Design a protein around this ligand. Sequence first.
Ligand SMILES: O=C(O)CNC(=O)C(=O)O
Ligand SMILES: [Mg+2]
Ligand code: NI
Ligand SMILES: [Zn+2]
Length: 331
Amino acid sequence: AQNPNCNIMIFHPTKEEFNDFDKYIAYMESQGAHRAGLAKIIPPKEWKARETYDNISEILIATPLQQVASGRAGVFTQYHKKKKAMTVGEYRHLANSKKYQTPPHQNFEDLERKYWKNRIYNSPIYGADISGSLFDENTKQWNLGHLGTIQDLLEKECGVVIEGVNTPYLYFGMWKTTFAWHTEDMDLYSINYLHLGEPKTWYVVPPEHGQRLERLARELFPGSSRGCGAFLRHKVALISPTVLKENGIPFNRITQEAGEFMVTFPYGYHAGFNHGFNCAEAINFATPRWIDYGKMASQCSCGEARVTFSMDAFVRILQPERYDLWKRGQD
Ligand SMILES: O=C(O)CNC(=O)C(=O)O
Ligand SMILES: [Mg+2]
Ligand code: NI
Ligand SMILES: [Zn+2]
């Protein structure tokens, strides 16, 4: 079995190997990459996402989110307080202000220590989940707006045509902005490209061990767990690496830098934080191997998770027994 310790793997495809996206995902899996839940892909030196980032300041962040924490430094939840709209230029200035800017630090490990010590005492503002793309239309390789759609994959595997669309999303971050522990909708893959700015640190649990994280989470957030049998779908809970290690949960960590892709694999729980002002693009995708994970994915039906239009067909076709309860939670 390849990669039996479930380490995060880093790949360096050549320009020729960068042509066929599906083929390269399958190659990474042949080497055991999915066992980690997360892989890094460094593009060939000949590749670029677009020419420059000099002209992005007028993009609007209609609903910036202030991420307010509750709990203790290593075990906390966050809620999202909606703020007034602002442009990317305005948000960048805000990220760089004395109130929000990254502190002086020695290296990524020192900054990680500072994150986990001090995150809860601040409320950073995240420009997350903005429909759009920064890939040039002429970029033909690993262009996240030109991937095969998940509806097409389901139709190809299973023969049923379904409604829905699959488009990318932009994330504008600042120091301490946080993504809570989660797997993707319907335990899909995700791919994330860091277009510009400061790094993003990731934590990940191997898919074969995801239920160990779920059991810890129920212990640590007992009110939330009574509320909902799949409350990590709410995407509000944080648990630090120190707490994971104290509880024997298998995990890994890695830092993504500008110009690098990350892929998350089906049922790979992940969480993390931004180092300073940055912009990432991400989208969900599927392969043949995903279908079995989609059929078995948990679902939140308590009302909290609320999701896109396109999840309806995935539940309806892959999980008909659960569909009526899930859709009530949508309503
Ligand atoms: O970058 C973030 O805030 C969150 N990203 C992801 O969870 C992802 O790409 O799958
Ligand atoms: Mg602009
Ligand atoms: Ni994700
Ligand atoms: Zn729920």
